[PDB]
Ligand binder design. Structure first.
Ligand SMILES: *[Se]c1ccccc1C(=O)Nc1ccccc1
Ligand SMILES: *[Se]c1ccccc1C(=O)Nc1ccccc1
Lengths: 373, 369
């Protein structure tokens, strides 16, 4: 008889696959820490994304992310995710990226940083589009931070406070543990392949709708409440139609997500025009959902305030998933470097529950098969 | 106080899925596709397209369709990079929706369209940009996708070479759960489009640690052609410290069924390197077992994969792409199985890093704006 482990969980839910020193998503304590440093501390003191990238990868504020070299994007497919996923994979031949097996830690760290900032450059060019002239390097070179250079390359003359919005969002979305995309990067890195191939694979896993973390569409709901005037009526109407309230649902932490609280505070101080309506919608959505089902513990998803912050920086909705990918490159690179030092291939097992030995003549459609008989 | 739950890193020996696709019966020394032995499939010369349908669908009847005309848009100098990048760009132009928004029939059709697209991309990339493309009219004269692949790449393929590739691809179609197959399932579990899953799996196959890629034995095989004594040459390689390529421990009970199948194909098709290769196999096996009478030493399947692939005029740099082409059958079958399972793959990790500390206490804080 074919048996299965007693604590068999399809999808490896709750199974410990690694021990990491990178970050601690303290869901019981309601805090998020990068190498022991709270994200609230990082975002309150206005630490740029390039420095947080160094902190996660290196464990200290050693060497920040360098600027991207001039490299026009070679892929124009109409999908920003596809453009950067394919673009990164082709960096290995032209830049001579060796397999992770054949390089030391210092080479891998430089390669990770070089490609990480190239992914940001590729997204900015793809977002700008092919029907618009490229921004000259001189305007980009006037900027001081990586985040500022990204917006300048994409928008030309971005609002300085919109740059501050992206830094708050990118830091808050830099790393959140062993998600599907981070797991994908570590598995590819565990084969010894080049860092470009590992980053490209993780981009593909992030594209999936079920991955979680991409900003949900809440602008149609926010626009309606601004027009109607009563938030409680709008949320009740959406629920009464059999639809789901976007941006709200089951709790992830024990309470309010620390990333969600950080993003809401950023929208207030930076002067988000939608902040007043968004707060009113949040309290109405919580009150309606916490009363209709008083048993569930329901909090606000971080994707609700991520959309508000990204919309404030004038990011189109179809571009929002790409903004999430750009920030997550810090967490991806940190886990890739840690996996290289770990030095063990990741290969789980599978239990066969299929048919037993059967002759080919016993398979449906065998007569159609052409053979030497 | 921070303690792990009696684990080892890398998920070794941990069951992640149950599968109906294939059973690598290592303790019985047999490999079966949906219960069908690969030895039976090869002995009756079942083509790769039919085996692709058997793995994905569980039955024959609708094999791999011919590839549509599409000149390869990526020329990076690496065949793996070309196909991996090219497959990812199929989604926007072909309207590939995420796996969450399509039914099984749509997913199966999209997998077949991309799977045969990957073979065409590899053939075009191998042929290079310094040569004109083979016209579609000549390709249509062929009857199988394996013959279409050789025609698109070489132009005037030897019929024996086509049979050699067909035998190798069947044995390399699927070998259970591995890093590349695991990667394809993980990406599919997010609901992403099948093109993204295949592109990610190709990157996983690129890694040297994956295993199964054709062994580097040509310099050694060329050597025994000179000396003429297999026994003398192998002993020298061990004596000066190097490792005999293509030989190692046991994988199955005694013999890998794919290795026996591939070797039988070499003699059936009159491979010139066959006589030398068998002599090296016996010389390497006898000396390795004699030096270490405890460890079970058996011929790696990748040793005979190099012999068969080289016979078909496949260069050494192309051999990893050849392995990628054959494995597309297994990846497509597992992606469809993952689609029906509908459970996201999301493991957990334990934090063993530094405790809560202020940013000022971290080294290098003074160099931060
Ligand atoms: Se971009 C740019 C262009 C000219 C002068 C200064 C800048 C700049 O760095 N702006 C900025 C960076 C970071 C945060 C807010 C604003
Ligand atoms: Se390809 C080709 C071109 C012209 C005529 C016949 C073929 C052909 O089918 N060759 C072949 C296919 C499969 C196995 C052996 C040979």
């Amino acid at each position: 008889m074919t048996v299965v482990p007693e604590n068999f969980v399809p999808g490896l839910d709750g199974v410990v696959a690694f021990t990491t020193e990178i970050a601690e998503p303290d869901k019981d304590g309601g805090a998020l820490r990068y190498r022991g440093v709270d994200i609230e501390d990082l975002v309150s003191q206005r630490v740029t994304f390039g420095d947080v990238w160094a902190l996660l990868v290196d464990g200290n504020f050693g060497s920040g992310l360098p600027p991207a070299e001039p490299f026009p994007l070679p892929i124009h497919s109409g999908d920003v995710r596809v453009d950067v996923q394919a673009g990164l994979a082709m960096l290995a031949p032209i830049w001579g990226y060796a397999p992770l097996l054949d390089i030391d830690d210092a080479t891998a760290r430089q390669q990770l940083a070089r490609a990480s900032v190239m992914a940001l450059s590729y997204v900015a060019q793809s977002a700008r589009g092919i029907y618009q002239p490229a921004v000259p390097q001189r305007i980009i070179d006037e900027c001081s931070t990586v985040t500022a250079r990204f917006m300048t390359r994409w928008q030309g003359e971005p609002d300085p406070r919109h740059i501050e919005a992206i830094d708050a969002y990118w830091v808050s979305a830099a790393e959140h543990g062993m998600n599907a995309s981070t797991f994908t990067a570590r598995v590819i890195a565990s084969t010894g392949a080049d860092v470009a191939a590992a980053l490209s694979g993780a981009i593909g896993a992030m594209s999936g709708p079920l991955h979680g973390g991409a900003p949900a569409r809440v602008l149609p709901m926010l626009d309606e409440v601004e027009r109607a005037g009563d938030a409680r009526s709008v949320v009740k109407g959406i629920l009464d139609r059999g639809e789901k309230l976007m941006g709200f649902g089951h709790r992830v932490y024990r309470a309010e997500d620390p990333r969600a609280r950080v993003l809401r505070a950023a929208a207030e101080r930076l002067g988000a025009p939608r902040y007043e309506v968004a707060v009113a919608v949040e309290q109405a959505a919580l009150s309606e959902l916490r009363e209709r089902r008083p048993d569930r513990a329901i909090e606000t998803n971080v994707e609700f305030w991520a959309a508000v912050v990204l919309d404030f920086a004038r990011v189109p909705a179809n571009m929002m998933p790409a903004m999430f990918t750009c920030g997550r490159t810090a967490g991806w690179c940190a886990h890739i470097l840690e996996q290289k030092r770990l030095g063990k291939l990741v290969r789980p097992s599978a239990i066969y529950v299929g048919p037993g030995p059967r002759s080919p003549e016993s398979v449906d459609g065998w007569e159609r098969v052409l053979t030497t008989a």
